[PDB]
């Protein structure tokens, strides 16, 4: 409750979902679309969480039996707390994310793909509806993230890093990204280029998965090891948690079209051109 009263951009997240259009359908199709996205993105982010090191997961992930029954109650508590203040549109999202906790057996790609997919499948030209539903969908994704981050129940130590107000930072980042994305491409929109965007989005995701499994089958014989599971000792995991929290907002959501092409016959001072990294510290021994 306190980390929510102590912020500035929660009302903006609240006002972003499902405006009563004029007299119109009143976001019924939006209700369906958001529920579908909760349903699928639950499995999506859970299987993303499946292959992780320690120190990056909640204690509600290691216990064997009754693992999908605790998340239900935690999300119900979060929805009660959001309702308690005034935010009746942020509690519905947690109700959805608690209903969709049964099936628990790089991301914006899947978000836009699913949005375009379901929208074109349902409407097979009003252009405002598209914009408000796209805004609601994209903000709902970041809301999923931030809602799941109100956890880890580490007595006091997890919340004392240096930020503790991550909601405003995440809101600013995603607001800039979505403003750019909406202004540049999704304009002059009619019922011809939705199918196009859907085709290229599906092709792009297929390329992403193909290269993912390829580099997964390629990374083993190389002599370039990155640990991916460092330690389970309860003194180095805190270092890594603090490092992730600090350097979280030193990254961006932008993707590049040529990131598997490399320079050849470099010198010793031209190696940095092959790193493809942001905030790259140089380490010596």
């Amino acid at each position: 409750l306190f980390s929510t009263m102590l912020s500035n951009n929660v009302d903006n997240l609240d006002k972003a979902y499902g405006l009563s259009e004029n007299i119109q359908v009143a976001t019924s199709t939006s209700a369906f679309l958001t529920f579908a996205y909760v349903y699928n993105g639950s499995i999506m982010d859970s299987v993303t969480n499946s292959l992780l090191p320690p120190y990056a997961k909640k204690p509600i992930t290691q216990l064997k039996y009754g693992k999908t029954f605790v998340f239900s109650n935690y999300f119900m508590l979060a929805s009660k707390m959001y309702d308690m203040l005034n935010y009746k549109n942020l509690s519905l999202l947690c109700e959805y994310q608690a209903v969709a906790s049964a099936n628990f057996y790089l991301a914006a790609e899947a978000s836009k793909y699913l949005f375009f997919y379901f929208f074109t499948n349902l409407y097979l030209f009003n252009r405002n509806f598209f914009m408000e539903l796209a805004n609601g969908f994209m903000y709902a994704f970041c809301f999923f993230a931030i809602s799941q981050m109100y956890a880890y129940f580490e007595n006091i130590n997890f919340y004392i890093t240096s930020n503790f107000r991550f909601l405003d930072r995440y809101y600013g980042v995603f607001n800039k990204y979505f403003i750019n994305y909406a202004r540049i491409k999704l304009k002059e929109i009619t019922s011809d280029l939705l199918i196009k965007y859907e085709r290229e989005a599906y092709l792009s995701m297929k390329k992403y998965g193909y290269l993912g499994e390829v580099i997964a089958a390629r990374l083993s014989p190389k002599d370039k090891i990155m640990n991916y599971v460092h330690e389970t000792n309860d003194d180095v995991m805190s270092n890594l948690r603090r490092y992730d929290m600090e350097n979280a907002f030193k990254n961006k959501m932008s993707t590049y079209v040529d990131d598997f092409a490399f320079f050849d016959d470099c010198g010793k001072n031209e190696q940095f051109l092959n790193e493809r990294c942001d905030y790259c510290p140089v380490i010596e021994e």
């Binding site: 509600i60 009660k80 129940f153």
Partner: peptide, 16 residues
């Protein structure tokens, strides 16, 4: 719950 380390459930019940 009651974990933080247990590997099984220590579920209890409360209301706010």
């Amino acid at each position: 719950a009651d974990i933080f380390f247990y590997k099984y459930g220590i579920i209890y019940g409360f209301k706010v």
